[PDB]
Structure 1
């Protein structure tokens, strides 16, 4: 299933990325001073997903902010492989 997670600041996004929990597809946006990770676990198991989500939620909170909201009024930063891209250029 799909999730939009909100981060209070960029460092927490970088922190998450270092964890190698880049849960299949992730797209990253900014909006109103915060960062939003669109997170698609498309095909994973209800187990891999549970432990994955739960770490993501140490650095973020579940948001009701719609992906369409973000698409038209947010800045798209990275699509599809966001956490991997952030880890590569920002992590460590």
Structure 2
């Protein structure tokens, strides 16, 4: 169904907030593009139940971006690449 999404987080701060809440199972790369932060979740191995869960969490802070993933990778720029959320927990959480 859906296992990689391009989510628009209202700003970077939404991504942070989200990172600070269970977002495990997400390799993730965080773009800022048009000053809005898209956060590209790349779920590696989740079932339908597991995504409906996880994707919820993300989408407490996000909406599901209408911007294509090849648009992020091309016409956007990385903010935290890696496991963006995970990395954000390191350098942004208090």
TM-score relative to the length of structure 1: 0.89
Asked if structure 2 preserves the Cα contact closer than 8 Å seen for 1:5 and 1:60, the reply is yes
Contact 2:11/2:37 (<8 A) preserved: yes
> Is the CA contact 1:23–1:39 (under 8 Å) kept in the aligned structure 2?
no
CA shift for structure 1 position 8? 1.4
> Equivalent residue of 1:6, what SS?
strand
Do the aligned partners of 1:6 and 1:60 also contact (CA within 8 Å) in 2? yes
Pairwise CA RMSD of aligned residues?
A: 1.3
What is the aligned length? 92
User: Residue 8 of structure 1 contacts residue 35 of structure 1 at CA under 8 Å; is this kept in 2?
Assistant: yes
**SS in structure 2 opposite 1:3?**
strand
Does structure 1 retain, via aligned residues, the 8 Å contact 2:22–2:57?
no
Q: CA deviation at 1:70?
A: 1.6
Task: Give the drift of 1:80.
Answer: 3.3
Unaligned runs of 5+ in 2: none
- Decide whether the 8 Å contact of 1:23 with 1:41 is kept in 2: yes
The alpha-carbon deviation at position 29 of structure 1 amounts to 0.5
Determine the C-alpha separation between the residues in 1 that align with 2:43 and 2:72: 19
Structure 1 runs not aligned, ≥5 long: none
Post-superposition offset of 1:22: 3.4
Output one character per residue of 1:41-91: Cα deviation in whole Å (capped at 9) or x when no partner: 121121121111111111001012011112221111222311000011101
